[PDB]
């Protein structure tokens, strides 16, 4: 079972002895520190953490003894604060005397603003604020996934709108393929859930259950998929029977959408001779609601897509849409599910545009690019102390490294407000109390072991919408 | 609870309908595919997955119904294979009719070799082999962490030996700082455990319980740490009182090693004036078993390390070792715990050598670089079907994309052998049965819901040792 006493960086076990004597308050905040890309971030994921790890009775006698025994060997010494944790158990029935204020999940906030704050509600538990820094900082991941996913939606929206004149099917244009390419099962659920803030297509099943448990949707599920082959279901038929494989598969799924990887041996042959000639009759007979979706999976992502499109364009009846862009017949589509990240996604859609192909024709699948190739330094997600009370006196604290002004932290009690022009501003040094910027936009989401405010997955999605989607009014 | 029926890529739910009819076996393998540097990989992590996710009764009535309900909505259709899963429940009491063979954990294997294979043991469960591809492929992570950590140990070993003449304290030269920088709690435990295959220093506590539960060590714990400050424990004293913070901290931990971040306001002032003059008397009196370990945390990693060393070298008595490199007094050391990955680690030690500073002086902490900034395509960890039996006839199968020969897969039944020169070779097309190449190095680790062979963390560490360590 999880033990919050064992869920922090080792050195933090020793920090209680390091604060100035008579410290009664430690106050800390989390921001996506400012540095041309990623100017605004989607705040998402804290609610998961609060519910799974921080709420209720997270301290027991058994957990204290367990931590005590581990740390004695781990430090080769008795530095573990047994007394502090026993106080929490006895005084608060194992509930954390902590208050956390945060912006609503789904909110899109410019870099450099306070996103959440943490402070102890009991003087005895001054040391507790930064004990849970490590676990709270992991919110960087759902935040970064949601933001990076949304940034890709922006690109897709722009090119779909330009090449087709609408945003139909936008929420199915970037599909989650990252299940095998992430570092764990838990990461898979968290990351997939973060992607679903922006899209509805996912193969990472783990995301569904997490959303249902911690967030909730009106609909039965937040994400969807359709049948598709893998290399094993093609190659198993033997190299000489790839056509037999294709025919069986499209026949088994004749009335629903089906995607078929076509690069096991020769993508260009499979498109031109097998799909385009041998099995063409089984494709042109398919309903608009059940297209064949051809998936290339190798080579240069842009070059392969362009060639595949030129091939299908010569074997199938291509139309020209109202914007002048070429469109495959509605029973035929393409998905590129290899080598896709935010950079290559941009290169492909731009390349398609230059060759007069509508983005209607294509969908994208992304795995490691979507869920694994992200770090905490992408958005500079950072947790710092800004305010302490020692000897009854409030002190505004901060770091300001001489060789890196970018690592400067904010001072004093923080608050988030609207500016007269409708933008966000973070106020420091308790200045929010002056009431010149209206009310603090942060909400208390956690206090004394209880989750005091939460958001449905439907509300989060609403909060995270694009302006171009909002401009459908 | 965890549901194996819900722990696969969505489209795999539909694969049981796509295999050739009359298919009784699907046989797949895992490799770190060679690319036209990481020429060898540490195999570690499978045993965790086997025990946590695959063993025992992993199928129940409720789990089948739950998946049926989820997939009906997820697909807007009834594609879920309720029959197949029910068969496993009734015939084998929810145990997976699967056999997995694997190279022993800790083993260091060149790229392009089979590391494990998976196959079904019951004809009806042909579809099951690749159902569990997704969960098994995630072993790429501890493999890649263990491998990348080991390569960094090679670099540290090389420079430590060259500048000091020995490898003393090597296993404490790269400390795990990655807990806050990883994507989740589970990843934290997995990654920290992989790093501990090569080193003994970690602040990612989660790794310790994972090792104890799934692997085991003779010693109480596999990893260690010492007291250290963070920015909050310094800054809380107020800007004008950094010295008070430093003094109080080194005094609290006078008898044990202590590390103190010194760049809150001005790293160069702190070393030359505060540590180097104001509090110098509290440093020079410390035991060799309890040094102060100064930590910079900003600026160019190499440039700051060099300047700090240059500062400390002129405020403290520096000796010159037998190899000619400069050495701080035993009560004073440095740890660089910011901006460290395998690339910058190389640049830092090389830079130190240029300036005649021994690697004895320095330790490294690595966080995101150690545990997060890694991907599956670093080693090209891949899982492919190589052999099936249809109509009673086994056929060798494989992919070979025209535009990327690097993605070509291996054919037929595989085995791993020692070459006459003592290296490694993977035999394809069942050629291992000819027995010209000694015994298959893969062992059955999993069969029919049971873990059949396990390894202690001690064995794994022994297996993954450096050659240069074996040379001593
Ligand atoms: O097809 C796959 N799923 C089914 C599927 C079919 C079509 C669409 S659609 O056209 O969006 C669409 C959606 C819709 F809701 C409704 C619709 F009508 C259509 C969505 C989904 C499928 C395919 C492949 C796949 N995978 C999961 C991992 N993989 C491979 O594994 C590797 C992982 O990637 P990385 O190496 O980068 O980490 C990579 O090679 C990658 O190809 C899944
Ligand atoms: O000191 C820290 N721990 C205690 C400690 C003290 C000394 C040594 S030693 O000299 O190896 C040594 C070892 C030994 F076994 C025995 C000995 F005698 C000596 C090891 C360990 C410490 C410090 C910092 C720290 N952290 C955990 C995250 N962090 C920060 O958080 C951030 C995470 O990094 P990324 O952004 O790259 O992801 C980064 O700013 C990073 O500095 C931990």
Curated annotation (Swiss-Prot), chain B:
CDD domains tied to this protein: PBEF_like
Tissues with expression: Expressed in large amounts in bone marrow, liver tissue, and muscle. Also present in heart, placenta, lung, and kidney tissues.
Reaction catalysed by this chain? Answer: beta-nicotinamide D-ribonucleotide + diphosphate = 5-phospho-alpha-D-ribose 1-diphosphate + nicotinamide + H(+)
Q: Name one GO cellular component term.
A: nuclear speck
Q: Which SUPFAM superfamilies match?
A: Nicotinate/Quinolinate PRTase C-terminal domain-like (SSF51690)
Q: Name one GO biological process term.
A: positive regulation of gene expression
Pathway it works in: Cofactor biosynthesis; NAD(+) biosynthesis; nicotinamide D-ribonucleotide from 5-phospho-alpha-D-ribose 1-diphosphate and nicotinamide: step 1/1
Instruction: Quote the record's activity regulation.
Output: Inhibited by FK866. FK866 competes for the same binding site as nicotinamide, but due to its very low dissociation rate, it is essentially an irreversible inhibitor.
A Pfam family hit: NAMPT_N
Q: What does this protein do?
A: Catalyzes the condensation of nicotinamide with 5-phosphoribosyl-1-pyrophosphate to yield nicotinamide mononucleotide, an intermediate in the biosynthesis of NAD. It is the rate limiting component in the mammalian NAD biosynthesis pathway. The secreted form behaves both as a cytokine with immunomodulating properties and an adipokine with anti-diabetic properties, it has no enzymatic activity, partly because of lack of activation by ATP, which has a low level in extracellular space and plasma. Plays a role in the modulation of circadian clock function.
Protein name, per record: Nicotinamide phosphoribosyltransferase
Q: Which gene encodes it?
A: NAMPT
């Amino acid at each position: 079972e999880f033990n919050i006493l064992l869920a922090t960086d080792s050195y933090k076990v020793t920090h209680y002895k390091q604060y100035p004597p008579n410290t009664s308050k430690v106050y800390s905040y989390f921001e996506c520190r400012e540095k041309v890309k990623y100017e605004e971030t989607v705040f998402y994921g804290l609610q998961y953490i609060l519910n799974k790890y921080l709420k209720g009775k997270v301290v027991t006698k058994e957990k204290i003894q367990e931590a005590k025994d581990v740390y004695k060997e781990h430090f080769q010494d008795d530095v573990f604060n047994e007394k502090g944790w026993n106080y929490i158990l006895e005084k608060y029935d194992g509930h954390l005397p902590i208050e956390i204020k945060a912006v609503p999940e789904g909110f899109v906030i410019p870099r450099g603003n306070v996103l959440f704050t943490v402070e102890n509600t009991d003087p005895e538990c001054y040391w507790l604020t930064n004990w849970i820094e490590t676990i709270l900082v992991q919110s960087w991941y759902p935040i970064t996934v949601a933001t990076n996913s949304r940034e890709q939606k922006k690109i897709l929206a722009k090119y779909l709108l330009e090449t087709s004149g609408n945003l139909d099917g936008l929420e199915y244009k970037l599909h989650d393929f990252g299940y095998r390419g992430v570092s764990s099962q838990e990461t898979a659920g968290i990351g997939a859930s973060a992607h679903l803030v922006n899209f509805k297509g996912t193969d990472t099943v783990a995301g569904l259950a997490l959303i249902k448990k911690y967030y909730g949707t009106k609909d039965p599920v937040p994400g969807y998929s359709v049948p598709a082959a893998e290399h094993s279901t093609i190659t198993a038929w033997g190299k000489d029977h790839e056509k037999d494989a294709f025919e069986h598969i499209v026949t088994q799924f004749s009335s629903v959408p089906v995607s078929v990887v076509s690069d096991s041996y020769d993508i260009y042959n499979a498109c031109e001779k097998i799909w385009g000639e041998d099995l063409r009759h089984l494709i042109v007979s398919r309903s608009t609601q059940a297209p064949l979706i051809i998936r290339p999976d190798s080579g240069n992502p842009l070059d392969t897509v362009l060639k595949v499109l030129e091939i299908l364009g010569k074997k199938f009846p291509v139309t020209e849409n109202s914007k002048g862009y070429k469109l495959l017949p509605p029973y035929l589509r393409v998905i590129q599910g290899d080598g896709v990240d935010i950079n290559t996604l941009q290169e492909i859609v731009e390349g398609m545009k230059q060759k007069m192909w509508s983005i209607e024709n294509i969908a994208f699948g992304s795995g490691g690019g979507l869920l694994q190739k992200l770090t905490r330094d992408l958005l500079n997600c950072s947790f710092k102390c800004s305010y302490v009370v020692t000897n009854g006196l409030g002190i505004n604290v901060f770091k300001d490294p001489v060789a890196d002004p970018n690592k400067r932290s904010k001072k004093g009690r923080l608050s988030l407000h609207r500016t007269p022009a409708g933008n966000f501003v973070t106020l420091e040094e308790g200045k929010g109390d002056l009431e010149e910027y209206g009310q603090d936009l942060l909400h208390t989401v956690f206090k004394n072991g209880k989750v005091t405010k939460s958001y449905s997955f439907d509300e989060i999605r609403k909060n995270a919408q694009l302006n171009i989607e909002l401009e459908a009014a």
